[PDB]
Design a protein around this ligand. Structure first.
Ligand code: GLC
Ligand code: GLC
Lengths: 729, 729
């Protein structure tokens, strides 16, 4: 109320020093109701100043001057100067105009996208301000669409400068926090647009077990329902709510079998053709909606209609949930048209997410992005990406940049959805990224040739995919703790580099590089390997400090930008001196919570990690070479400790503390072994290999080893040898 | 009043046989006030005819039929047929529609343009008509913005056919003539976006003197004011009105020192962030504008506001003008937004140009183009061109085409502003064009690497730049006389070829070729030299008549299109038989008016030149080999005469006449010397050089010399040798 100012037909609410709501009302009434985007305008009071005259008003905070000259909002009447110097003359917002500096957000979908597509703006800007227009409908108390806002213009001016994390936290306070995911969502999902039988699906699930690949989720795509069995007078088989009985003669029994294998089960739902007269639930729906059954009147999709939504959840989904379906894959691609003006995809995500909470605690959906605030309905489903290096090269940037509009749970089809071209190396690189993405869901097109099964590929590719898929389940504790941090504290699992390093120009120059939780920095390789090196590469920016390759221990002295090379089976993931990462020791075990945690410690500095769980909190501290583990509640959990290289403690129960000062701090990784391996795999001349090995062995001074490699005629081989010299310096 | 016709809600004013004002008024009131564009609708009466019926009206002049069918102006209701056959079916104007043939005009700026950008239409068309919409606000008697015209549509139909010069003269009568420039504007300007001190700036000015480079103007860019010293709470240091005291501890003394060196002084003004609380004039401005100083209320830029404009001119510029600032570089790039709907750049140019007349007679500004009529506020400042061959290749066309909307004083950054790439040959070619452009202002970016100082470059490039910079000061008499002709007679200094040769197709095919005053035709080279020839080239159209290279005397028989080759140190500039060009003999002397004029005469025909000056008129006549000089008033001025090659008279005082009939008419230039030089510099085989020299020396018949060069395997060498044979024919 002191944070509220009316002037002419406008209303201004100073929510934080850095966040102002700006409204216009012809009627003099302004909007207090929630909207599709905004769930909460309750914020603690803040200091600001006002200069009010007859004709004009200026609102002044620590970061912004907002001016209003009266009348209708125009670029001339409503504008703001930030109190920052990030630019020479892009420090002014004008109503209705775009400025430079927006770091972007996300978009609905990657359907049919081969590589890059345009993104919407987010709330983050290098120049320190962004405007988020609220164009949505108002809600009722219980979250039904109520109609048009009486605030016919309703904007949020963000003026956080480059405090991106606080901008995002306050956005979550305005639009509501992301809910907690359930632990099962963070495991591997299996999916394929393939007409499995109950028998061939269970045989595939048992082959995953036999192949030592853990799964959390069993997706059944659209061939679960009638497709070619649909008479053409009704249109296509794309939408379906009736089991194909040939393939699934006893659905509940099939779902019981997946449940006995400790899998959660989801079905594809294409809702757009509604419930037509051939469907199994049609007689019930027709009775509830008073349809003309002798004229075979369809229950057309209509999520604006309360009776339709009830029949959809109770009489269409209800019978399938009773057969054991755990959650819904909402797969909408049929446009944004409704008589209400609300995007049907928005109505589906909002209502289905709420309905999912009835059957299961912290339940999810799987659906496309439905605009600002739709993070309240995880998980994101990016859809029909084209299978290409260009698509993979876009995806890490896409994923990290989405955190800028608070949409932090994108599930991409890992390996790409459709079209494009076969390349087992592309499939393996894509799975490496997926394992270090918010969700790891293997999925593919209707092709006989696009299965993401590891054993589709040669023995090298298969073993590497199996190792990465196991690593995903090892990461579930770290992922689930970051998930609770997203839900409780408004911090993204995947952050662009500029969230941690806002003032470092290099944090804006590595689009595909990101922080993954608080302990790991990932630089996926998204380019086909150089056949002369038998290695792929990516330019990595190393922030100030000592960094270790998470897998090898190879060290890097920051701050530096350095091209790094990896075999197709290895991924650039880095941890700082002092990093502590927990890993499940038993990733193949079907355990609700890990019976055994490996604490992986990176030497050379202090650190700590807080492991949040369903029913506990465990703190791991590393302070002057003393490692301590405590928990809120006690348990039988057995702790394993790995300090750099060496397993120090194995399966020790309860709370404890152990001194690692005089333990071996150094990893195995050495310049000589790594040099030999890189030269050995290279498809270069044996004379060159022999000369490089002899000269780098005989030349003692680091500066002369570098001078030697600088004479090499292969420019990319120079860069690979320079990486090793830089790490071995 | 007889030249005025009302019909339905329309008003038509026949201003010339070739110019009709077309107005629409809902209210039946039509607009008599001046607008931002139009200063004068007083024109002498002309004959025309009217066919008026109940429903329709036709106005008939010597060149156009204008029809109006009544009602609202639409493409169907308002249209015109020209009485010309320049096209088969583009001879009709339709209201609101574009036709072919417009020869274009100019645009606001070359900021961030690498090469070509789109231009606005001008008033010139190959098909003989153009419409100039007046969309501006009305003015008061004294030239303040009065608001919206009551003529809610106000157009000028030009139907001059290809009498382009008369179209432009009548446009100047409608919109007001260009003012006279002061003589100092036509000299060399020094500018660099560089943080000079008072000491390093004067040392640079004294280095120009020592290097024999004359300057008229000393520009001080934005580092004159506080930049990094501005607290970030106020935004950037881009706008500033406070001297940086480290660099300029005594500003008035520094400006007195430039004034003692006979330089005019301008400062960069970035007006867009107005006068903020840290500035030195802020306490005065705050008092005048009743600002809240304890809340550090900014005097935001507002040129719609009379009190703001007064405080800006009196309390912000005023104290700097008293320190000695001669005129203002208005450097606006922050958009076209104002509550009035008037472009802030327009308000700045109109008001600053008027305010500049208080301190100095015929004073100037330096600012971007602000639309039709803004020629009333010279000089044009094109801004942040990209440093490239593509940008230089665009600039002569840009400059000549601007005359088509009467904007004849463009000042380009000579050598290009920013980004792009280093090439000393590009810098030298750019300076050659600049010397033959309306204004010769050297300027460059904030780079340590972009200085336009001649001694930045090697000895060859340096000497050539020094020779061109001296030539600019030799040209000041010719430039200042053309300036008075622009102001008094509405003729551009720089004309496209089609102004003189409207019916010659070739005058439309040499975009970069132009007339420079009445005596010189310029074809700048704007392409990197061919390294095999060690020469650059340009295709020149030579109109009917005998033409001489202005520098060498090399002759050309028109009419012909011919590729001409020059070393990087030489520029294609041509004069007709009979041409008389005055040159200052003492370009390095700091003389208000030249004490000594060289009259350079090209033989083979009669001619004359009228030298207009501040306080005199001198006529030079060349009639059957008799050269006479007379003046309105007498003086001590000493005249030197150069007839072709030879200095005939040296430093002869007062009026006189001398017979040159039996003086040597022929220049030195000869085929043999020129051939030897071209072969000698070429990076071709010595066997080829030897064979070409021997064959062209031994073959006597011109047609067989041409047949010989036609067999040469080097196509561009053929063209170079053909130029020499054509000149030596
Ligand atoms: O259900 C069949 C297919 O439908 C749509 O194209 C989905 O976006 C895709 O994920 C799915 O495999
Ligand atoms: O004042 C610094 C710079 O500002 C703008 O970019 C001007 O257009 C340029 O001419 C100047 O050097």
């Amino acid at each position: 109320n002191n944070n509220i100012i009316k002037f002419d037909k406008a209303r201004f609410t100073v929510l934080t020093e850095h966040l102002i709501r700006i409204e216009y009302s012809e009627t003099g009434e302004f909007e207090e109701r929630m909207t599709q985007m905004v769930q909460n305008r309750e914020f603690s009071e803040v200091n600001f100043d006002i200069i009010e005259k007859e004709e004009t008003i200026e609102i002044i905070t620590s970061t912004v001057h907002l001016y209003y000259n009266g009348g209708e909002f125009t670029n001339a009447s409503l504008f703001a100067d930030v109190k920052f110097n990030f630019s020479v003359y892009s420090n002014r917002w004008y109503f209705g105009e775009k400025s430079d500096g927006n770091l972007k957000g996300t978009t609905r979908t990657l359907d049919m996208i081969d590589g890059e597509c345009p993104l919407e703006d987010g709330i983050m800007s290098k120049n320190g301000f962004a405007v988020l227009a609220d164009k949505g409908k108002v809600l009722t108390e219980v979250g039904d669409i109520a109609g048009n806002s009486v605030s016919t213009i309703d904007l949020y001016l963000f003026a956080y400068g480059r405090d991106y994390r606080q901008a995002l936290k306050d956005f979550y306070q305005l639009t509501g926090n992301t809910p907690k995911l359930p632990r099962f969502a963070l495991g591997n999902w299996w999916s394929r647009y393939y007409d499995y039988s109950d028998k061939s699906y269970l045989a595939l699930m048992d082959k995953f077990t036999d192949k030592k690949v853990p799964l959390s989720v069993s997706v059944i795509d659209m061939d679960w329902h009638k497709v070619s069995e649909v008479p053409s007078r009704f249109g296509s088989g794309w939408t379906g709510y009736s089991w194909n009985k040939k393939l699934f003669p006893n659905p509940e029994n099939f779902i019981d079998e997946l449940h006995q294998r400790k899998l959660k089960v989801t079905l594809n739902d294409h809702p757009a053709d509604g419930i037509r007269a051939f469907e199994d639930p049609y007689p019930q729906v027709a009775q509830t909606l008073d349809l003309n059954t002798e004229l075979e009147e369809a229950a057309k999709f209509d999520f604006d209609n309360l009776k339709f939504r009830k029949a959809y959840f109770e009489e269409v989904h209800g019978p399938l949930e009773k057969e054991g379906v755990d959650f819904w894959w909402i797969d909408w691609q049929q446009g944004a048209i409704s008589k209400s003006g609300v995007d049907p995809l928005w109505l589906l995500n909002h209502y289905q997410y709420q309905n999912a909470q009835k059957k299961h605690k912290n339940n999810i959906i799987l659906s496309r992005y439905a605009g600002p605030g739709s993070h309240r309905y995880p998980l994101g489903f990016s859809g029909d990406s084209v299978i290409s290096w260009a698509s993979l090269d876009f995806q890490p940037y896409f994923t990290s940049t989405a955190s800028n509009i608070g949409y932090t749970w994108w599930s991409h089809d890992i390996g790409g959805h459709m079209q494009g071209y076969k390349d087992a190396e592309l499939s393996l690189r894509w799975l490496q990224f997926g394992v270090f993405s918010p969700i790891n869901r293997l999925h593919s097109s209707k092709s006989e040739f696009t299965s993401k099964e590891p054993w589709h590929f040669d023995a090298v590719i298969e073993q590497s995919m199996i190792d990465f898929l196991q690593l995903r389940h090892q990461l579930i504790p770290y992922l689930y703790s970051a998930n609770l941090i997203t839900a409780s504290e408004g911090r993204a699992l995947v952050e662009p580099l500029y969230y941690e390093y806002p003032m470092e120009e290099e944090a804006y120059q590595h689009r595909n590089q990101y922080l993954f939780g608080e302990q790991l920095m990932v630089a996926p390789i998204t380019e086909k390997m150089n056949s002369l090196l038998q290695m792929g590469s990516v330019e990595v920016w190393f922030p100030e400090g000592t960094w270790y390759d998470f897998f090898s221990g190879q060290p890097y002295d920051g701050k530096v930008s350095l091209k790094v090379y990896r075999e197709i089976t290895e991924m650039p993931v880095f941890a700082k001196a002092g990093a502590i990462i927990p890993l499940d020791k038993n990733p193949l075990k079907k355990e609700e919570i890990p019976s055994e945690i490996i604490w992986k410690i990176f030497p050379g500095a202090d650190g700590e990690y807080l492991l949040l769980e369903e029913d506990n909190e465990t703190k791991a501290e590393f302070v002057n070479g003393i490692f301590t583990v405590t928990s809120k509640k006690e348990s039988s959990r057995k702790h394993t400790i790995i300090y750099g290289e060496h397993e120090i403690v194995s399966a020790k129960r309860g709370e404890f503390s152990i001194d690692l000062n005089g333990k071996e701090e150094n990893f195995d990784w050495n310049f000589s072994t790594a040099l030999f391996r890189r030269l050995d795999i290279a498809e270069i001349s044996y004379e060159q290999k022999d000369e490089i090995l002899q000269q780098l062995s005989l030349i003692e001074e680091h500066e002369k080893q570098v001078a030697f490699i600088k004479t090499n005629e292969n420019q990319e081989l120079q860069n690979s040898l320079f990486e090793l010299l830089y790490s071995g310096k």
